[PDB]
Symmetry: D2
Subunit: 263 residues, 4 copies
């Protein structure tokens, strides 16, 4: 009776200018698995709420998998587009396990690792980030990658990643909105380097509200505003990591592993 499906799961975005990076990921998946149905879900409640408000279907992972059981899928590979295996990724794993083996439902539900899975992923991410840098960035000019940050233990992925980036370039820095390293830590790194021009790039899949507001906003407490007050030319780049082929390739490999775990 066998039927295989793929569930792509993003934190998500509700802003029109940011959704293209999701669609680009959808194409990549379709191109690599032309005969497997692909469905979407979103882990953030507030974003499902805004998307429904605009008249767009936006299922939670639970709704998506109940709907997929209803369409007769038996084996589903779930791939998050999270960066780290934090709270949301763990919740997604609990949700997948809960659906597998329910009566008359899904036989097998596998979950692909987020971006920074193994130490080998972390080193591959560092390389992909380097390959993603804007052509106009000059050698010596620091780049701050902005991650979300979390109180979850997987926060340790950000300082782990900083290790790998430095092995490539002493001027590539990691900062987070809510964890460690903090933006203050990043500014202290910038002061010792006496950098005059600094690039800012989101570490998340899509350049969402943290990217547009906390990293590059007009208000005083944004990263670019804070850098301007200390005389630094801030160059924010509003592209999520899902726009990079070299980064996306790592999510794709994770999806391949999850499909293979279905048998």
């Amino acid at each position: 009776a066998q039927k295989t499906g793929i569930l792509l799961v993003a934190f998500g975005t509700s802003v029109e200018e940011a959704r293209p990076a999701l669609d680009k990921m959808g194409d990549r998946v379709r191109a690599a698995h032309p005969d497997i149905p692909v469905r979407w879900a979103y882990t953030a409640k507030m974003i499902r709420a805004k998307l429904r408000a605009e008249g767009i279907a936006a299922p939670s992972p639970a709704e998506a998998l109940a709907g997929m059981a209803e369409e007769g899928f038996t084996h589903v590979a779930v791939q998050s587009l999270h960066t780290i295996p934090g709270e949301e990724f763990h919740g997604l794993l609990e949700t997948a396990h809960a659906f597998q083996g329910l009566p008359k439902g899904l036989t097998r539900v596998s979950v692909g690792l987020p971006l920074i899975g193994t130490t080998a992923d972390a080193e591959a991410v560092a390389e992909a980030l380097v390959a993603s840098l804007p052509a106009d960035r000059k050698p010596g000019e620091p780049v701050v990658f902005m991650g979300h940050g979390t109180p979850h233990p997987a926060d340790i992925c950000y300082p782990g990643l900083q290790y790998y980036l430095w092995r490539l370039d002493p001027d590539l820095l990691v900062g987070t909105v809510e964890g460690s390293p903090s933006f203050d830590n990043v500014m202290a790194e910038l002061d010792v380097r006496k950098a005059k021009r600094v690039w800012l790039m989101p570490l998340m899949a899509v350049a969402g509200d943290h990217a547009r507001n906390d990293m590059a906003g007009d208000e005083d407490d944004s990263w670019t505003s804070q850098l301007a007050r200390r005389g630094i030319e801030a160059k924010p780049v509003l592209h999520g990591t899902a726009e990079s082929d070299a980064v996306a390739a790592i999510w794709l490999r994770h999806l391949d592993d999850a499909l293979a775990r279905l048998n």
Copy 2:
């Protein structure tokens, strides 16, 4: 943040003439719990399929509970309108347990017992069945109650119930379409009683397709057709047990117990 909901779950029916017994149960629940939201789900895949085909929303228990988590419910009392704790009732229990405690989802999901829960329910069902008999049934005229039957061990509820019915009336008989006692067992009971007029009543919540076709159909292998060939005046009664107040009261008590199990 607390919010309590009730999920009523029927095997279900897709035939217009049979759905009124479901609506009657919905009223009873509303009348007994005027301030608790009440939602519906259906355990039979083929029936969800026919209802969707007619343009009617018919969620599986999984879809229903994912939707309810999405509306912000935290504590849900699930009540099946199954007759016995067989395969479908067990699947419903697995499905409820799977949803409870998922991240950002339902805190507590309780499940009410089907009709024949304890031996005290079984005795109460026997009494309610007796109270439900048509006024025109005469003393001495046998009544055959038709249950579904199952290969599941809960099939033992049918012969258990027969025990309780006989304590009340030697001429009340239990038969099933797919289990034990069989219709052949019932006919052998009828032969020793030399009964000339026999009543047939569904044991299920709604007088569905088994009631209209297997019990009372025009075709040769229906119960009434088989009784007519042996010279018995068959009186089929097309009312599910959900139409009886005395029977419905037992499902209601089960729902009260399940609400109390939420705290």
Copy 3:
């Protein structure tokens, strides 16, 4: 790495005169599966406590399965010698599921049905009980089988069984210490039959404390004492059903099904 084991689980007994029926079951299992290791566990806490007090190892199902994981077993078939799928049997099922698939532990843990599993088992039990009757019991003399009884819904197995027994012999009766039918129900059955000699047989695997005390005790409230006060010659028979080959054969078949469910 594969290694298959069998876990036999009894409610248990702590009285020397009753343990032989367990040993007889152990032989039967060894004889039918000569190359599979067989281990024991007991569901009753008070009995594990008395056996430890006498210096006898008596593991709970949890201790047994943790020990078996430790010896390198990978696939274990658990067979209860319970009569009905009540509270204890359900707890055993939860305990088996909990062990299967734990890291570096058991791959597969299956559970065999108790005696009264399907309606087909129930009919086979009725036949086996009849075959087990003492040769001196005369036709027409009632036999009361004593079951435990439980508030669990599986109590419905006792009146279910009574149905099957009556199909064979109108004078075979089922009574229970704690459920339905009650001993009062049995005495009302005896009064209408005006029986002068009545046989009492335990329905449980071993003739334990309920058999020696509640059924056949010297005190006033025992079954035999109550029957003597109403002028009935009570003939108690202190053999658990595990002593009968015809009954044991049903547990053995259940164990075969559970072994096959391992693959």
Copy 4:
């Protein structure tokens, strides 16, 4: 009926010279919770096997918790003395969850975080490691901390920790036997620093076989042997991190959090 217990879980050691660090942890726990029973278990199969071979009881976490359920404990706080939340720590979490809520068993089983739990733990570990250094280590002399390493994603804790250590001292280095950073990575760090005297300290709770053999062994492929071949005075220090009060204090705090999670 309430009864609270503490389960201390070590990877473990089977070598006499190394077990004192476990006993020191046992005292610390007893001293901080004088009225709570404390039990031991070990996650490594090969070590349970060697300890049983020497006649010492060495239960797996499953055996321990089944035994504790048997003694009447209801609420158990499990604390691993693992360094990272890798494969073994995850297995321990699965095992604890499996025991909680089993019939007549443990009501609540909580699990304390391993050493490197949050980014705040990671920074506290870095500080504790610094405080643990031998008094004879001179400023400027590098120290290599040896961790296990794992293919599990929690391997990212080692490069995460390296980040925190460097914030304190550019000459503190992290290396692992089986993950990243590798010993080759550490030697390349040593070459750029042209270090003549290097200290080696185990990162694990006990200075076990990896410490005595892979880090400080006489054979050619040991860390100290490899450093001697390149003209470096290697100073191995055979004390597990459990010997340090400043490090142990972090495990103790984790145990406090796990006790509080019992209510």
